[PDB]
Amino acid sequence: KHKILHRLLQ
Amino acid sequence: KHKILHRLLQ
Amino acid sequence: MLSDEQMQIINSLVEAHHKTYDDSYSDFVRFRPPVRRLSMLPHLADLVSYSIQKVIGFAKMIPGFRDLTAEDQIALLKSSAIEIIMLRSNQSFSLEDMSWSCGGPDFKYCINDVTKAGHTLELLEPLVKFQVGLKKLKLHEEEHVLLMAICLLSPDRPGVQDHVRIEALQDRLCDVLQAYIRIQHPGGRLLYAKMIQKLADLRSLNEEHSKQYRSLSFQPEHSMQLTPLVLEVFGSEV
Amino acid sequence: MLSDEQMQIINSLVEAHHKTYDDSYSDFVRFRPPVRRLSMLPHLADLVSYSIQKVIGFAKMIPGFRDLTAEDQIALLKSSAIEIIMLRSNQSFSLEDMSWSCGGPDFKYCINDVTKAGHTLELLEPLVKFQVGLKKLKLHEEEHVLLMAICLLSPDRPGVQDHVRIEALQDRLCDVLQAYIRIQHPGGRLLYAKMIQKLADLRSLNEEHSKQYRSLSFQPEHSMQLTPLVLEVFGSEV
Numbered sequence: 001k002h003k004i005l006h007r008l009l010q
Numbered sequence: 011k012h013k014i015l016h017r018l019l020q
Numbered sequence: 021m022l023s024d025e026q027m028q029i030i031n032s033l034v035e036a037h038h039k040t041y042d043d044s045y046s047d048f049v050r051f052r053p054p055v056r057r058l059s060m061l062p063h064l065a066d067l068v069s070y071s072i073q074k075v076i077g078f079a080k081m082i083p084g085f086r087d088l089t090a091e092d093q094i095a096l097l098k099s100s101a102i103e104i105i106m107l108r109s110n111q112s113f114s115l116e117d118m119s120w121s122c123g124g125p126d127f128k129y130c131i132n133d134v135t136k137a138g139h140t141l142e143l144l145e146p147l148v149k150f151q152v153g154l155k156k157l158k159l160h161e162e163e164h165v166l167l168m169a170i171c172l173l174s175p176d177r178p179g180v181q182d183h184v185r186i187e188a189l190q191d192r193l194c195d196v197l198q199a200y201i202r203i204q205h206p207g208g209r210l211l212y213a214k215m216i217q218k219l220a221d222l223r224s225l226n227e228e229h230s231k232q233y234r235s236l237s238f239q240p241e242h243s244m245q246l247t248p249l250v251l252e253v254f255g256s257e258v
Numbered sequence: 259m260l261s262d263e264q265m266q267i268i269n270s271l272v273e274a275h276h277k278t279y280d281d282s283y284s285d286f287v288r289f290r291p292p293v294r295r296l297s298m299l300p301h302l303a304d305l306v307s308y309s310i311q312k313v314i315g316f317a318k319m320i321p322g323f324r325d326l327t328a329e330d331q332i333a334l335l336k337s338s339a340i341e342i343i344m345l346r347s348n349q350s351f352s353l354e355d356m357s358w359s360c361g362g363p364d365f366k367y368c369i370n371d372v373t374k375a376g377h378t379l380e381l382l383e384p385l386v387k388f389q390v391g392l393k394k395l396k397l398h399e400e401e402h403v404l405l406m407a408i409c410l411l412s413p414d415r416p417g418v419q420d421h422v423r424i425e426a427l428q429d430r431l432c433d434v435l436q437a438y439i440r441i442q443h444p445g446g447r448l449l450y451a452k453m454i455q456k457l458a459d460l461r462s463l464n465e466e467h468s469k470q471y472r473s474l475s476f477q478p479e480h481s482m483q484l485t486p487l488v489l490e491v492f493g494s495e496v
């Protein structure tokens with residue numbers, strides 16, 4: 001659900 | 011699911 | 021001779037297009053600016069997103085589109101929006117430049133500008149050849165808008181419920197276009213068939229574009245640059 | 259005397275802030291431009307969205323934040339991002355102007371500019387008074403970054419799992435801040451308590467801001483102007 005946040009968290 | 015599209019369709 | 025109900029349909033399709041297409045392109049100064057890593061995705065995502073609102077505006081003024089169930093309206097728009105976009109961009113396409121020219125060198129989009137937004141020549145090779153062949157047809161304003169309205173009113177889209185009803189709508193527009201050409205477009209004897217062919221190429225362009233959108237939207241570093249309406253309309257939710 | 263492990267924590271919090279905060283504000287030319295109906299929501303939504311990426315970048319360099327389960331990292335960030343934003347904006351806040359000045363009159367944001375983005379004086383009245391009182395504290399660079407890191411490492415947020423672990427992290431930062439002030443900040447005898455109070459006001463500012471974001475995000479005409487990361491981070495998904 002946090003598709004962008006996971007990406008951003010490397 | 012088309013929250014914006016419904017708005018835009020008046 | 022066109023009927024009175026036929027030229028009404030032409031009168032309101034032309035007016036609908038004029039209210040939703042601004043030849044000054046002055047709103048374009050409000051998009052995230054163009055950068056020429058994919059440097060044009062913010063500006064182009066904004067340009068498409070804005071265009072989608074114009075197509076929704078145009079659609080709501082097609083005779084009897086508003087009368088459809090709100091699920092059909094959404095179904096028609098999710099599948100056809102990108103084709104109407106490609107169709108309507110013909111108005112800024114320039115054979116002299118081989119680019120869409122929207123007033124100023126900063127809103128002049130070469131093929132390269134579009135590759136710097138995620139897309140490949142596999143979509144940009146057929147798309148430009150579609151643009152020039154449509155440009156060569158030299159359509160009257162009434163034909164352009166009729167074709168966009170026929171495109172939007174296609175029954176054979178995924179998710180449409182009233183197949184009967186909107187096929188009848190699209191039938192009524194095709195007959196207007198056939199009559200308009202024969203009566204008002206001198207030398208138009210083959211024009212209707214060429215236009216119909218353009219609809220077919222649109223399905224091929226749509227398919228390639230949807231492929232390439234998928235791969236963008238599966239990479240969060242790129243999909244975070246899209247807008248909320250792009251993601252809702254080009255998205256795959258049912 | 260600070261320990262050697264204490265000044266390491268200060269050294270890497272300062273470096274983390276320097277890598278994620280660009281005093282030239284030159285990236286700001288890439289946001290949808292400011293318009294001064296809510297005319298500033300595109301530019302401000304873009305500004306917050308960009309700031310959120312800087313805070314994610316900063317957080318990933320706090321000692322041991324990366325060591326947390328990826329669910330805790332997200333939980334910490336979804337609840338604290340807006341407070342870190344309010345904290346870090348102090349660096350561009352100007353007591354002379356009563357505005358955030360980011361290089362150029364076009365990136366100078368009065369209170370009015372923020373109301374033209376959806377927000378009311380119910381959030382902007384306490385937010386500005388928080389800004390000036392924090393500005394008056396005249397924090398060292400080391401204290402500013404310590405406070406942002408203590409804010410982010412709060413155990414008492416909704417959705418955090420390892421309450422034990424990150425309370426210990428935040429404990430280790432508070433002790434650094436207490437020691438730094440006493441040893442390096444002359445006349446700092448009450449500074450630690452004032453800083454702690456600033457954290458409390460942040461929870462009150464967060465609560466008001468989340469209220470006002472809800473009402474924006476419940477109106478599609480406005481929420482379509484937000485960005486995908488804003489909607490994912492300030493959004494209420496668990």
Ligand SMILES: C=C1/C(=C\C=C(/C)c2cccc(CCC#CCC(O)(C(F)(F)F)C(F)(F)F)c2)C[C@@H](O)C[C@@H]1O
Pocket residue numbers: 061064065066067068069071102105106108109110111112113120122129134137138139147233236246250254
């Ligand atoms: C659109 C118009 C105009 C020009 C059209 C252009 C330049 C154009 C060029 C190549 C391809 C397309 C199709 C839409 C796409 C996409 C992007 C994307 O796939 C992604 F960004 F992800 F790359 C997405 F945005 F759709 F998501 C449009 C100008 C004016 O004639 C108004 C008209 O309406």
Ligand SMILES: C=C1/C(=C\C=C(/C)c2cccc(CCC#CCC(O)(C(F)(F)F)C(F)(F)F)c2)C[C@@H](O)C[C@@H]1O
Pocket residue numbers: 299302303304305306307309340343344346347348349350351358360367372375376377385471474484488492
């Ligand atoms: C943020 C920073 C800076 C300034 C902060 C400003 C001007 C500011 C002013 C008032 C309030 C806030 C808090 C975030 C909000 C919101 C908007 C919104 O609620 C909505 F848009 F919906 F209205 C959303 F965007 F959050 F959604 C920031 C500049 C520089 O110091 C970098 C720093 O990082």
